Design a protein around this ligand. Structure first.
Ligand SMILES: Cc1cc(/C=C/C#N)cc(C)c1Nc1ccnc(Nc2ccc(C#N)cc2)n1
Ligand SMILES: NCc1ccc(OC(F)(F)F)cc1
Ligand SMILES: [Mg+2]
Lengths: 412, 556
């Protein structure tokens, strides 16, 4: 009922983005899903007069036996007008990240209840390819708000508010945040109590006519950071001291008051790398003064909503990964390390793809938007494999680091 | 009469802000006009075009062209201007099937759909833009004005609109007859199956009846096209496929042109003929682009050519795909950044072959190239078969594990097994993770004057060993590498090296086994001879001893 008019940005045409190759099982899953969607009126076949395309694939979400259609709308989303008239953008709740439990629901199915503006539908065109291109790819466009599109939460926001209105007044201490196809619900209650309340919310959705049953549990109050820490040792080798001086030199770009002068003095001579050097008093004081500095927050760090977030990741080995989220170099908004390995133990690329998902999630909770990634992987390796491991309903932007960073050492 | 279902028209627009073409009609000879008038009269009778009134402002030029050893004429409309102004369409004809992805068929029949080809209705609102003018005899009358009612040959949207229309009417037949395949190419339909011959011919007749519902007649006659088919540079046979004949010329003198053609043939051949190599021949095309320039063949190119001639000596065929069997991909290193592969299901019968060439860059190694080759084959295989083959690779499992666990980048290759087929890919050196006890420590450094290009490189060690060498025509980065080289050259089998060079660390941490830089190559050669090497970095100008001493020495 009553479509909202949508436009692209001035001077921009719609996306024409190549469909990448899909495995037989993904094609079969999509044929099946789309046949049902077409029957339900969600999508319609299109003709050759529609030149546009956006890539599509299929994923298996967390703990699930069935495929989910995932459209990569990144190009369309850039080309789509921002959303203004009623909505200025919603002030991002700062309390969401402070909650004890945040559960993430996929609410994207609700979007299918709102018709998409008839003039904008052509820009949602997508193709189901055939193996070896032996039959013409199947061409569709959306008749309703598609999952993954920037415009969907914006347009649906009016309907969503009414649906959650009784729940929010009945539960005022709860933060509800919506990003893309996700709904983030925080609470400080006992996890059993938290869960029942999540299911309470689900019923609010279902009763209004309609992967909802799922939930993904976060505990952002437990999220921890990485201050710069220095070794505490009884005996320092020449090599230990060189490593120390190297690490401090790096740190001094972040923290101005850092001094290496006295420590470097210990290095004077030409000495075997493994020889033990006793610290001088001046060296110990300097090291001590440095430790104190490093217990402090970084000076002049601030988030600017008008700037991109940048995320860098280092492979540390043994399934360990470190990462930093920043706007300007050396002013880190967040840092972190992932140890925990869910499968992935023989696969670097699966690990990286999961790190990428966790970092984006953290980014959405804290700032309400996704970072641009600098990935320590070759483009061709990433592009071939990442879709096999992707469980998220959104996708961030990335670029590729081909030169090994020296600073890996110091986030270790 | 029997009612037929109409073909729904595809709505068409000009690009935004653009109007239709207005292009002057060329004068023509009296006989060409007469022949065009005759042609258009007939076309008009068939409903393909209609005469229009004076009010249509649009025009596209029309020509008459000889039948070449016949007396008859054909109408050519030059749609270049209208095409510029016509919207883009979805192009389905990209994504050509690869023969190695096809399934064997007992029977393949061809049907002539040529009468549908020129009869597809054109969107009513767009017709005005197709206006053309037969010039009048002596130009003493107004030219005869026509517009198209059907997709004109040569117009931008005709192939896409004809393809989409045909697919749409074929869909229910395909869907309800899963036991055949149907493919449209130009004005033909190709129908394959495994059916007993009687059942196959029945399917063909049913297809003809189906098409009849849209008024599309196909000739009762037996089509002149039979397997084998010459298609897109291939020969397709019922149970096998190949590339059309590849014959390499003998020449005592070769030009740029002949080399591009030679490389093209070899590239085309490489998808079935195993082991084809283009490296040395492709080189001769570096730079230049003056086309008629004759290039002398290097001995290396001559050898590559001779090797290719041997491979191409007798025909080789690929088999088709059997979905019930695993795909296997095997890869061999050929040298000079070249890799070759075979994809098969049963031993000794390839579906297809192919090659991969090392990417351009300052430094590289075999493991990285092998990995890239694997990703390329993977992607190709997804396109053709919709799945990843199992790989057989000339690299030991232990070598791979040592590589990926220690490499600074995330890296992965899918399910694979070692095949012992020299030359094997191996790690030529690995650096220590910890400083070596009992190993001499070399503090290295180098520096150069950016103006004079004069420099020094050298080292000092914990044993008081020292060297400084004067250098000409060098740079800071080069002297930094030179210093590492000297320490490697002058030390024993185990060595600790301390450098301040972020540049050198960047290169060495990338683990190259080969480089375009002569110096990096010498460094690699030295590393290969060591038992243990620990490379330690420190920041410059910090008063770190032995680094400052050697920095002072080399800074002149
Ligand atoms: C792409 C294609 C080109 C031609 C024809 C193009 C032309 N000219 C004919 C057909 C029927 C097809 N389509 C498919 C689809 C699946 N398997 C096959 N196998 C197959 C095709 C031809 C022969 C033969 N001989 C053997 C097996 N063909
Ligand atoms: N109206 C006659 C006609 C013209 C073309 C046809 O083939 C088509 F399917 F459109 F490609 C089918 C029928
Ligand atoms: Mg120096």
């Amino acid at each position: 009922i009553e479509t909202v008019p949508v436009k692209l940005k001035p001077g921009m045409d719609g996306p024409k983005v190549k469909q990448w190759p899909l495995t037989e099982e993904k094609i079969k899953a999509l044929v099946e899903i789309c046949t049902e969607m077409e029957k339900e009126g969600k999508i319609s076949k299109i003709g050759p007069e529609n030149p546009y395309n956006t890539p599509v694939f299929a994923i298996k979400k967390k703990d699930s036996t069935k495929w989910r259609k995932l459209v990569d709308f990144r190009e369309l989303n850039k080309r789509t007008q921002d959303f203004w008239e009623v909505q200025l953008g919603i002030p991002h709740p700062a309390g969401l990240k402070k909650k004890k439990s945040v559960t993430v629901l996929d609410v994207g199915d609700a979007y299918f209840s709102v018709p998409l503006d008839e003039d904008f539908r052509k820009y949602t065109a997508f193709t189901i390819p055939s193996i070896n291109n032996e039959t013409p790819g199947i061409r569709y466009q959306y008749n309703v708000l598609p999952q993954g599109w920037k415009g969907s939460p914006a347009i649906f926001q009016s309907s969503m508010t009414k649906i959650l209105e009784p729940f929010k007044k009945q539960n005022p201490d709860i933060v509800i945040y919506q990003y893309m196809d996700d709904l983030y619900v925080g609470s400080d209650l006992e996890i059993g109590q938290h869960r029942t309340k999540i299911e309470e919310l689900r019923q609010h959705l279902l009763r209004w006519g309609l992967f909802l049953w799922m939930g993904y549990e976060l505990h952002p109050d437990k999220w921890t950071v990485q201050p710069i820490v220095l070794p505490e040792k009884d005996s320092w080798t020449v090599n230990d001291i060189q490593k120390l001086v190297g690490k401090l030199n790096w740190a001094s770009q972040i923290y101005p008051g850092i001094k290496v002068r006295q420590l470097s003095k210990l290095l004077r001579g030409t000495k075997a790398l493994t020889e033990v050097i006793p610290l001088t008093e001046e060296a110990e004081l300097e090291l001590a003064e440095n430790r104190e500095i490093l217990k402090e927050p970084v000076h002049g760090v601030y988030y600017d909503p008008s700037k991109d977030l940048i995320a860098e990741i280092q492979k540390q080995g043994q399934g360990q990964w470190t990462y930093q989220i920043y706007q300007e170099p050396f002013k880190n908004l967040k840092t972190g390390k992932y140890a925990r390995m869910r499968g992935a133990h023989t696969n670097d690329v699966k690990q990286l793809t999961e790190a990428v998902q966790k970092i984006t999630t953290e980014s959405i909770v804290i700032w309400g938007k996704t970072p641009k990634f600098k990935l320590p992987i070759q483009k061709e390796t990433w592009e071939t494999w990442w879709t096999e491991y992707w469980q998220a309903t959104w996708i961030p932007e990335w670029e590729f680091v081909n030169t090994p960073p020296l600073v890996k050492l110091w986030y270790q | 009469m029997v009612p037929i279902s109409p073909i729904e028209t595809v709505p068409v627009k000009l690009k935004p802000g653009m109007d239709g073409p207005k292009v002057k009609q060329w004068p023509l000879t009296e006989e060409k006009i007469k022949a065009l008038v005759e042609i258009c009269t007939e076309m008009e009778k068939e409903g393909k075009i209609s005469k229009i009134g004076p009010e249509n402002p649009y025009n596209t030029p029309v020509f008459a062209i000889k039948k070449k050893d016949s007396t008859k004429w054909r109408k050519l409309v030059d749609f270049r201007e209208l095409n510029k102004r016509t919207q883009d369409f979805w192009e389905v004809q990209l994504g050509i099937p690869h023969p190695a992805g096809l399934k064997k068929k007992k029977s393949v029949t061809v049907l002539d759909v040529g009468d549908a080809y020129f009869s597809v209705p054109l969107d009513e609102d767009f017709r005005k833009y197709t206006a053309f003018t037969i010039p009048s005899i002596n130009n003493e009358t107004p030219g005869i004005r026509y517009q198209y009612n059907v997709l004109p040959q040569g117009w931008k949207g005709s192939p896409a609109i004809f393809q989409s229309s045909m697919t749409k009417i074929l869909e229910p037949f395909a869907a309800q007859n899963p036991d055949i395949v149907i493919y449209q190419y130009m004005d033909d339909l190709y129908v394959g199956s495994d059916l007993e011959i009687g059942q196959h011919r029945t399917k063909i007749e049913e297809l003809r009846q189906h098409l009849l519902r849209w008024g599309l007649t196909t000739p009762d006659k037996k089509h002149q096209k039979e397997p084998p088919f010459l298609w897109m540079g291939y020969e397709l046979h019922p149970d096998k496929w190949t590339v059309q004949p590849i014959v390499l010329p003998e020449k005592d003198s070769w030009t740029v042109n002949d080399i591009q053609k030679l490389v093209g043939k070899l590239n085309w051949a490489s998808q079935i003929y195993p082991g084809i190599k283009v490296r040395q021949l492709s080189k001769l095309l570096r730079g230049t682009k003056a086309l008629t320039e004759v290039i002398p063949l290097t001995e290396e190119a001559e050898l590559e050519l001779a090797e290719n001639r041997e491979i191409l000596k007798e025909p080789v065929h690929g088999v088709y795909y059997d979905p019930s069997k695993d795909l296997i991909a095997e890869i061999q290193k050929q040298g000079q950044g070249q890799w070759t592969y075979q994809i098969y299901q049963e031993p000794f019968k390839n579906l297809k072959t192919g090659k991969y060439a090392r990417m351009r860059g300052a430094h590289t190694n075999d493991v990285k190239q092998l990995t890239e080759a694997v990703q390329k084959i993977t992607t190709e295989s997804i396109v053709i078969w919709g799945k990843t083959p199992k790989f057989k690779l000339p690299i030991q499992k232990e070598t791979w594990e040592t590589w990926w666990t220690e490499y600074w980048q995330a890296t992965w290759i899918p399910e694979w097994e070692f095949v012992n087929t020299p030359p094997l890919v191996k790690l030529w050196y690995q650096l220590e993770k910890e400083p070596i006890v009992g190993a001499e420590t070399f503090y290295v450094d180098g520096a150069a004057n950016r103006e004079t290009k004069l420099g020094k490189a050298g080292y000092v060690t914990n044993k008081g060993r020292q060297k400084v060498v004067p250098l000409t025509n060098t740079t800071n980065q080069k002297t930094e590498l030179q210093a590492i080289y000297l320490a490697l050259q002058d030390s024993g089998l185990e060595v600790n090296i301390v450098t301040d060079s972020q540049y050198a660390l960047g290169i060495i941490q990338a683990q190259p086994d080969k480089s375009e830089s002569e110096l990096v190559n010498q460094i690699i050669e030295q590393l290969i001879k060591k038992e243990k090497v620990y490379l330690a970095w420190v920041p410059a100008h910090k008063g770190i001893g032995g680094n400052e001493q050697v920095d002072k020495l080399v800074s002149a």
